[PDB]
Design an enzyme around this catalytic site. Sequence first.
Site, PDB file in Angstrom:
ATOM      1  N   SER A 251       0.780  -1.453   0.203  1.00 15.42           N
ATOM      2  CA  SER A 251       0.021  -0.081  -0.056  1.00 15.42           C
ATOM      3  C   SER A 251       0.734   1.527   0.054  1.00 15.42           C
ATOM      4  O   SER A 251       0.032   2.415  -0.406  1.00 15.42           O
ATOM      5  CB  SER A 251      -0.825   0.109   1.155  1.00 15.42           C
ATOM      6  OG  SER A 251      -2.062  -0.867   1.019  1.00 15.42           O
TER       7      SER A 251
ATOM      8  N   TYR B  30     -10.704   2.737   4.833  1.00 10.41           N
ATOM      9  CA  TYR B  30      -9.514   2.479   4.020  1.00 10.41           C
ATOM     10  C   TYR B  30      -9.999   1.579   2.898  1.00 10.41           C
ATOM     11  O   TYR B  30     -10.302   0.366   3.400  1.00 10.41           O
ATOM     12  CB  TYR B  30      -8.350   2.151   4.809  1.00 10.41           C
ATOM     13  CG  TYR B  30      -7.052   1.874   3.917  1.00 10.41           C
ATOM     14  CD1 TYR B  30      -6.853   0.608   3.559  1.00 10.41           C
ATOM     15  CD2 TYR B  30      -6.186   3.106   3.936  1.00 10.41           C
ATOM     16  CE1 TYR B  30      -5.369   0.467   3.030  1.00 10.41           C
ATOM     17  CE2 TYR B  30      -5.008   2.833   3.330  1.00 10.41           C
ATOM     18  CZ  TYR B  30      -4.548   1.622   2.984  1.00 10.41           C
ATOM     19  OH  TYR B  30      -3.137   1.155   2.371  1.00 10.41           O
TER      20      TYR B  30
ATOM     21  N   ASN C  76      -9.031  -0.388  -1.001  1.00  9.65           N
ATOM     22  CA  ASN C  76      -8.040  -0.432  -2.385  1.00  9.65           C
ATOM     23  C   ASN C  76      -9.037  -0.171  -3.560  1.00  9.65           C
ATOM     24  O   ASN C  76      -8.440   0.361  -4.619  1.00  9.65           O
ATOM     25  CB  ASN C  76      -7.430  -1.837  -2.565  1.00  9.65           C
ATOM     26  CG  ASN C  76      -6.353  -2.109  -1.607  1.00  9.65           C
ATOM     27  OD1 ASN C  76      -5.631  -0.990  -1.078  1.00  9.65           O
ATOM     28  ND2 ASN C  76      -5.980  -3.298  -1.109  1.00  9.65           N
TER      29      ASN C  76
ATOM     30  N   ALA D  27       1.499  -3.251   2.894  1.00  9.59           N
ATOM     31  CA  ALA D  27       1.482  -4.674   2.992  1.00  9.59           C
ATOM     32  C   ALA D  27       1.278  -5.404   1.640  1.00  9.59           C
ATOM     33  O   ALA D  27       0.257  -4.866   1.095  1.00  9.59           O
ATOM     34  CB  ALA D  27       0.704  -5.206   4.145  1.00  9.59           C
TER      35      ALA D  27
ATOM     36  N   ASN E  58       5.521  -9.550   5.977  1.00  8.13           N
ATOM     37  CA  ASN E  58       4.410  -8.693   6.538  1.00  8.13           C
ATOM     38  C   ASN E  58       4.165  -8.767   8.135  1.00  8.13           C
ATOM     39  O   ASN E  58       3.352  -9.655   8.585  1.00  8.13           O
ATOM     40  CB  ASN E  58       2.850  -8.981   5.782  1.00  8.13           C
ATOM     41  CG  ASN E  58       1.883  -8.083   6.359  1.00  8.13           C
ATOM     42  OD1 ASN E  58       1.987  -7.310   7.071  1.00  8.13           O
ATOM     43  ND2 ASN E  58       0.786  -8.465   5.753  1.00  8.13           N
TER      44      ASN E  58
END
EC number: 3.5.2.6
Length: 355
Positions: free
Chosen positions: A61, A147, A149, A312, A337
Amino acid sequence: APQQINDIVHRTITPLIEQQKIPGMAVAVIYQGKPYYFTWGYADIAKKQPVTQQTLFELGSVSKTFTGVLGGDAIARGEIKLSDPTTKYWPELTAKQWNGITLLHLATYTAGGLPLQVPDEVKSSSDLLRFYQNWQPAWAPGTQRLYANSSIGLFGALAVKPSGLSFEQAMQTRVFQPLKLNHTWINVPPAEEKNYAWGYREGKAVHVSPGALDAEAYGVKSTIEDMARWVQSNLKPLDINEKTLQQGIQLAQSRYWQTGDMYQGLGWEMLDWPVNPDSIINGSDNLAARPVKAITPPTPAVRASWVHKTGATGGFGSYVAFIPEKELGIVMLANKNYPNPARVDAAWQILNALQ
Ligand SMILES: O=C(O)c1c[nH]c(-c2ccccc2)n1
Ligand SMILES: O=C(O)c1c[nH]c(-c2ccccc2)n1
């Protein structure tokens, strides 16, 4: 490096690698504007390849910051506006929930609850249209941050429409090339595969899977050297020769929304410096829906901010943080991660000591 810098970095990172069982890591500190580099462990365990300054890491990200900046560049070019409705660049988005959802809302996770992930089952591009057409907002636009994507990924795809470039072409020519990020890739070329670190999830070597809007949301790979250079550019936008890029950076660090102590930029996220470490450390833990307060009009990039981004993939964990007024920054790239708060903590510990 100067001994102060050597000492704080090592005394902080060494324990972190040990605690988190991180197979490989690279760190860059920007101090009074110049980069200092550190590497540990393994890029590829099986092949015994060490992490170097030329090792490529998945940014996950942290890729969103490139997207915010490319988006800000398109703005400064006058090709798009953040106040434009999404339908202006995707007229096929005829479903009525889309009235009043702007590019701003897309870029800042405030559209009304677009999901964190585009579903895996969305292969074709008409699958994609279906997904956004059939999506049902939980909230009115501009009222909550979640949040996602699918939110910023979409902003990235649309922002480059008027250019007529693919996202990748636009990114390479308008951001990577001008900044001399010559080892930064949306798609790793075969020439650079030898440098592509493996990620490690549950001890297994993994690279990021292809998926919808991956490039726009989580798809960049980079070296510690280029990443340092990214921090330098974002620290000092006004030294950038290309006019619209310079403004693009400044736009990505504008404060559009406030939740708690944090302000949402384009990709970047921001707190007033000096900052409470517990406010960023606990703040970073990885669905958190938060009401937002609109900053009307957005605040231009505040030099006295802690500007940061977590990132991540299945096998990678990254962190970038910088303080413009101090000319101070850090990049931390790992091929595991591991918890966000550990990252932010290591970063605050390092930066606080050099400040
Ligand atoms: O190879 C090129 O020069 C190239 C690639 N894309 C474009 C382009 C695409 C849309 C509008 C303008 C130029 N030119
Ligand atoms: O002309 C050169 O020395 C040159 C240009 N690029 C490179 C290079 C290529 C791949 C990885 C690192 C450096 N060397």
